[PDB]
Amino acid sequence: PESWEPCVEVVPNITYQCMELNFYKIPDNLPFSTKNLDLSFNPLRHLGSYSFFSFPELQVLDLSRCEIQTIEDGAYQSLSHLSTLILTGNPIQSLALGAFSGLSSLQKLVAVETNLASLENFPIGHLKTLKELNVAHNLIQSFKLPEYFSNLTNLEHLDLSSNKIQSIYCTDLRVLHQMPLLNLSLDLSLNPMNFIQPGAFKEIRLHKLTLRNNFDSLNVMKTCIQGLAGLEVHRLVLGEFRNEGNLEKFDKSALEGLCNLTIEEFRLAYLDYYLDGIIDLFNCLTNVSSFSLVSVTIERVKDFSYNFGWQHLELVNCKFGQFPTLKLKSLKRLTFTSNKGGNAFSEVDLPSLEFLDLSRNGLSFKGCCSQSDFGTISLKYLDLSFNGVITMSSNFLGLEQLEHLDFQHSNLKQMSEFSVFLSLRNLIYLDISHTHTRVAFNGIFNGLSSLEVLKMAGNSFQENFLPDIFTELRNLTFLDLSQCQLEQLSPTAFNSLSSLQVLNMSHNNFFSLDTFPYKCLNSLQVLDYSLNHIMTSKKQELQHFPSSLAFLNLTQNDFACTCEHQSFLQWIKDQRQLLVEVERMECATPSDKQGMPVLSLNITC
Amino acid sequence: EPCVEVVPNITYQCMELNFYKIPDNLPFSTKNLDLSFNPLRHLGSYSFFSFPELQVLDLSRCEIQTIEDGAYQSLSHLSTLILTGNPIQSLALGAFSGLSSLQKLVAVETNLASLENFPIGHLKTLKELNVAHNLIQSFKLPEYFSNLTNLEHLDLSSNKIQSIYCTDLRVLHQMPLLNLSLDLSLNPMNFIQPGAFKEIRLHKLTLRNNFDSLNVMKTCIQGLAGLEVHRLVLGEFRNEGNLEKFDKSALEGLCNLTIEEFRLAYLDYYLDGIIDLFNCLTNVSSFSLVSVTIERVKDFSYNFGWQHLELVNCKFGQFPTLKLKSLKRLTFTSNKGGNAFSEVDLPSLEFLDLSRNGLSFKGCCSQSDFGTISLKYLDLSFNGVITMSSNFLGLEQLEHLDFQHSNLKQMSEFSVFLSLRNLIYLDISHTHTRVAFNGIFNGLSSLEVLKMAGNSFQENFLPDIFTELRNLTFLDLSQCQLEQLSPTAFNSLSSLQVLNMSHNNFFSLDTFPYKCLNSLQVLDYSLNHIMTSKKQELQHFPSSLAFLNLTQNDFACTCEHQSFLQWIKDQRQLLVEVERMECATPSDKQGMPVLSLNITC
Amino acid sequence: QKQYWVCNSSDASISYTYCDKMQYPISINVNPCIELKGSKGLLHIFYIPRRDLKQLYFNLYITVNTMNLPKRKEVICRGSDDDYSFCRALKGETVNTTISFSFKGIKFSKGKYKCVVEAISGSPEEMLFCLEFVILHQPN
Amino acid sequence: QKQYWVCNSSDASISYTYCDKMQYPISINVNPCIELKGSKGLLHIFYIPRRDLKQLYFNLYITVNTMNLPKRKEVICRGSDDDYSFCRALKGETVNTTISFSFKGIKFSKGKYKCVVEAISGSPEEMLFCLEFVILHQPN
Ligand SMILES: *[C@@H]1O[C@H](CO)[C@@H](O[C@@H]2O[C@H](CO)[C@@H](O)[C@H](O)[C@H]2NC(C)=O)[C@H](O)[C@H]1NC(C)=O
Ligand SMILES: *[C@@H]1O[C@H](CO)[C@@H](O[C@@H]2O[C@H](CO)[C@@H](O)[C@H](O)[C@H]2NC(C)=O)[C@H](O)[C@H]1NC(C)=O
Ligand SMILES: *[C@@H]1O[C@H](CO)[C@@H](O[C@@H]2O[C@H](CO)[C@@H](O)[C@H](O)[C@H]2NC(C)=O)[C@H](O)[C@H]1NC(C)=O
Ligand SMILES: *[C@@H]1O[C@H](CO)[C@@H](O[C@@H]2O[C@H](CO)[C@@H](O)[C@H](O)[C@H]2NC(C)=O)[C@H](O)[C@H]1NC(C)=O
Ligand SMILES: *[C@@H]1O[C@H](CO)[C@@H](O)[C@H](O)[C@H]1NC(C)=O
Ligand SMILES: *[C@@H]1O[C@H](CO)[C@@H](O)[C@H](O)[C@H]1NC(C)=O
Ligand SMILES: *[C@@H]1O[C@H](CO)[C@@H](O)[C@H](O)[C@H]1NC(C)=O
Ligand SMILES: *[C@@H]1O[C@H](CO)[C@@H](O)[C@H](O)[C@H]1NC(C)=O
């Protein structure tokens, strides 16, 4: 029981959590070297001068939900190293002018739900180091940025979401026009926004504007978007919240005002309204370099065949009637993930495409894969995991540049009917784990000479036997054969794999541990043999492990702990320094010893 | 006899052996004689005197140019004669005299130029006539056809018939009771005389690949006006000349025949949509498309009156949206295109075969998937991923359900068959189901056949997942990686007759789980790794057990397992292929039949 | 250790307890009460979370008349521009929110369902709370 | 006994021998010759089967430089209203036909491919013929 208790020591000398411990005062029982202090949920109520004198080293200070009602001049005066101060959910009634003097290093100030009514009198003007101000969930009615904002030269994030702003006027942003270093992100979500004045954002430059769930109606939305005219935004995020008041209609005119801003990246994040189709909807965003829809519903996806100039398209957690037909000349990166509905993949035409993420859609793929499915010869990265049945009919013709291929948990078919990976001379990473591949062809991995990582857990092999299907895979460093119902190894399966570092043989059906097949694995560091049925091993077969082996996992096997197997049990003691979680290595038999840790075994042999 | 003895005293294969004449060294009691591919060249009188008992005489490709009077005179029992591919020059009237039992006459490719010069007018027993692949130019059926009063199948395909005139059909007009199926496929037809088929009734007409062009097709169909056909088969052949177009007008003339069943078998032309194309067939009771390509299939939302719809080996852009009020049976199998299942609305549907499409099926299965509450039969086998999200609400009348080899998901996330109180048959074999919920089979109180071979169980353990299934008579748990059984797994299964535990990973035979099985006749434990019987409950097999398959196991033939090894011999009556029970484990006994082993130590 | 009766419906009787040590007060109203045959309504929640709701998910351990279901993992907040506004909530922030819900399509056996709902959120993602729902199902 | 040389293309060199006792003459012609990088053409077959072609299918047993592929079953004739007219052809009947073919899009390893094609047909189905096709493939 230590001097810092009841607080929890997260990182000795450094980080202490004194959350919810009925502390009525800043504790005095902590190291002077403490950098991170969590004092959230304590009835501190009041913060007088030099309240944190005991913590000259503090960098992160959390005072969330501490019932703090008044903070006096100099309260933090000694904390010239503090970068993060968190004040969330304190009903602040009185906040002295010098409340935050001494905070010479403050980068992040979280004042969420601290009863803030106005930024004008909010005593932070002197914190020139401030990178982020979060004042969400307060009572601010005015987007008039006070003049001291001219001082906040490093401000990169300002969060004003969940306040009471109804209107934004041109003269509200007077201060911003004077201002140099602009990497400014602004969240204005969940303000009951009824009007933004045309001109208000003329010649304003923002990194990011988030405006979700601001608008009572479509017309109010249209009105307010017009007031953004001339805004220059790297990233614009529109949309609304599912658990929140939502727009009742949403037609082609809804985003017509976007034609008057300069937007590099666009996201629409959640829309309640079911879109019949997108004809004309996104006309102002045809040349945005990044276009993203999340959680929107679109019945007719026929209209995605339009040649937008997007370089990055992201469609996530959407519901589409059909798989979109995509013909995008400039698209480099496609993320189409976690979508529902129509879900048979159909050919896309994407000549610039290098990055393809098609995962987690439950997609069917009638005949995979080649340039003609995608329209590109430049693909480096293909993620087709967590989908439906993918029938292999082409061995990646035209996709010779692929470096990363993931089919994980997709039901692959026809995997043994030809060398389905033959074209892939540059593939570095392949995951065909849990694809229900039943290996019945020794040429299954022909072509994969650059392969470094091969995950194929949870498949199976003809005769539960591992044949020599790897001899061409010289550059392999990671191989996962766990859950493959393996019973026998070809003594030669692994001979060429002299770069292999991690071999996973977990959860297969081995009854003994034969080290011979592993003798040529000069780089082998990690060998996982857990969750097999290993009961014994002959002395001779235990001797061939490369000495590079650092982690052997033999946990959860069926060790027989009689004198008949003394050599194996002895060998296990001898290799203790290689063995992982020896606690979890238990005698399965005899019943005398069942449950007894193999290393602490009491036997006389 | 260089002839093969296929069935002693009965059937002999004298095929391709250089016979210049008919074998005389065969039993008098030969029923089936195959003399194909011999240079017989000539058949003189009583050529088959030696075979009074003959029923099936195959004479394919025997270079026969002439058949004399009474060639087959002795063969009063002959029901099938096969003359395929003989370059027949001379045929006299008595050529087929004496074939008073003859039901089937195959004269395919026999240099036949006319039916008029084909002496069969007296074979009144004749049921099938195949004169395909000849030189017949006229569809005129000779007067003697009126004597052929039992004829049911006439194959006139691959002949040279170009046109059909009314007077051609005279004989048939005088035979109103003839039940005729007629194949005219692959005749270069350019004309059918309107009126020629007025008051003609056919059981079946097949007209595949008869027409050069769409216009020729339409004109010849107009020539069919008035025909009554039970079953009309149109279409063409993948390896022949095919129609250049096929528009909505193609089948206009069909409005003027009475058709019970229609099939379009193979169409080379890719249809855009079927709007208007088939509206002459709106009230056909059975509608079938085979090997047709159709991109836009929303046209099936049209309210046709079909009672049976068959779509097989077609290519659709999209799964077709079917709204048909009267459809009782749907066969949508072996189709190979656009293939996510989408909701159909079929209120009369009792029989759904949706197998072998590689179909995707999100959120199976519910009355709102099919629009019927009368579904009795559901085949969703050999498909892609089927996700279970509804336990057959509104499908309580289902008796047969088949998912074999489709990838089933979410099977352990609730009781997926809960509603299926009337299901009798269930196949979920090879569905990649890992059983991890003990309520997986709740609801199945009437189930009698459960096949779930090729799946797996959490922990390779068989739990009490069957207690509700009192009516099971057939259970297949083979290939399921099973290692352990709940002793009470089969407790309630008193009607179980066949249990398949084959191809699992059991290392011992414990007969305890089987003791309450009064009805058990067949227990299959082949292809496991049984070496011992550990629980000396070797005694509690039910009296009813008649077939215990223990072949291809890993018997340990040492003194340590003498009891089990003895027991094996004690009831070799139950055991099935005793020889295929071989020692595995003492290497010096490896291979040896277990029932040959020396039981003294 | 107290039982918290949520609501009764035409189908269902719903209560919960805590399954964690630090049993933070939560307020859960459902209007109208869940009918297992299928229903729609509003879930009202009032909560002061002791971690950020960022990346909220539920592990659900469900039991049907003693029979365990495999764990389900239900992701509520994916991390970035989330559907639900409460995903933005911080440690100590008032969450007073209304969430709509809807479902149909599953017949449930009569009896007793437990649902251990293990909420997880934050950056070194830790447990927010654990509630154990008991739902008695009397069908029709 | 002998090697029947079918044709050479830019990609490939095709020949066959028999693998059954009953070495019935078939005439196989391909126009133009198969290029493995993809081709279309016409397969001309002249043959007289010693059984009906009903329910014809091929078991294909393919080898790539000594590496065996799993058996492929390729069904040619379903048995009722078949696509191909020769499905109708009887035991003693001259099959003189042209079958169009077309394919693309499989990279093949350099080397020697053998493909045993065992044709099977009829009800009570028996072996029609066995042909062992050798194809030598040198890409580009
Ligand atoms: C080898 O594969 C197995 C899965 O087959 C991995 O096992 C998982 O490991 C973590 C511990 O690191 C467990 O918490 C998971 O539950 C395990 N999954 C299981 C048992 O299915 C294992 O981590 C892999 N080994 C290596 C070195 O990567
Ligand atoms: C067997 O032991 C090793 C311990 O070294 C485990 O490997 C770790 O697995 C985790 C997660 O799976 C990885 O992120 C770590 O990198 C692995 N460590 C090393 C050194 O490779 C493995 O999980 C254990 N297997 C099982 C089934 O528990
Ligand atoms: C139990 O299931 C196995 C397959 O899991 C059946 O084995 C087949 O049996 C026939 C005839 O004995 C063999 O020729 C087949 O090759 C077998 N198939 C396989 C995959 O091995 C067995 O017949 C079933 N037993 C019973 C009684 O129905
Ligand atoms: C084990 O023996 C049994 C009983 O002799 C075999 O069962 C037969 O299997 C086939 C289909 O699999 C059925 O058509 C027969 O009706 C079954 N026979 C009986 C008597 O029911 C079984 O095939 C054998 N298993 C093997 C060889 O794996
Ligand atoms: C800007 O911040 C400084 C702190 O260095 C403060 O003294 C001053 O009040 C602010 N600027 C102006 C113009 O007053
Ligand atoms: C009809 O068949 C009988 C014998 O069955 C025969 O006597 C008669 O000549 C035949 N009639 C005609 C018109 O061929
Ligand atoms: C929760 O929110 C509603 C709607 O904004 C508000 O009226 C109500 O008073 C709040 N409830 C509590 C308990 O604070
Ligand atoms: C095969 O048929 C064609 C007509 O399609 C014909 O020209 C040719 O002579 C025939 N070949 C033989 C060998 O009979």
XYZ file of N, CA and C in Angstrom, chain B residues 321-327 342-349 367-372:
63
model
N -37.076 -10.017 -61.055
C -38.069 -9.642 -60.057
C -39.401 -10.251 -60.456
N -39.769 -11.335 -59.780
C -40.958 -12.104 -60.124
C -42.134 -11.758 -59.236
N -43.202 -11.295 -59.873
C -44.495 -11.093 -59.232
C -45.521 -11.831 -60.086
N -45.871 -13.042 -59.675
C -46.775 -13.896 -60.444
C -47.778 -14.492 -59.501
N -49.052 -14.174 -59.702
C -50.066 -14.528 -58.722
C -50.335 -16.021 -58.677
N -50.111 -16.712 -59.788
C -50.596 -18.071 -59.935
C -49.539 -19.147 -59.921
N -48.283 -18.746 -59.786
C -47.161 -19.674 -59.875
C -47.092 -20.576 -58.663
N -33.101 -11.320 -54.912
C -33.972 -10.268 -54.379
C -35.412 -10.743 -54.282
N -36.153 -10.126 -53.355
C -37.524 -10.494 -53.016
C -38.353 -10.801 -54.245
N -39.023 -11.942 -54.209
C -40.054 -12.230 -55.186
C -41.402 -12.220 -54.493
N -42.456 -12.020 -55.264
C -43.793 -11.997 -54.721
C -44.597 -13.063 -55.456
N -44.732 -14.227 -54.824
C -45.319 -15.396 -55.465
C -46.331 -16.104 -54.546
N -47.543 -15.529 -54.397
C -48.509 -15.965 -53.365
C -49.011 -17.408 -53.450
N -48.955 -18.014 -54.630
C -49.390 -19.407 -54.807
C -48.255 -20.430 -54.719
N -47.043 -19.943 -54.497
C -45.855 -20.794 -54.561
C -45.809 -21.886 -53.493
N -41.370 -15.181 -45.312
C -42.438 -15.062 -46.276
C -42.302 -13.794 -47.130
N -41.691 -12.741 -46.592
C -41.524 -11.516 -47.377
C -40.361 -11.583 -48.374
N -39.623 -12.687 -48.357
C -38.629 -12.947 -49.376
C -39.309 -13.506 -50.641
N -40.368 -14.288 -50.432
C -41.007 -15.078 -51.488
C -42.457 -14.709 -51.770
N -43.089 -13.954 -50.871
C -44.507 -13.549 -50.988
C -45.530 -14.680 -50.835
N -45.094 -15.832 -50.334
C -45.971 -16.981 -50.161
C -45.961 -17.430 -48.711
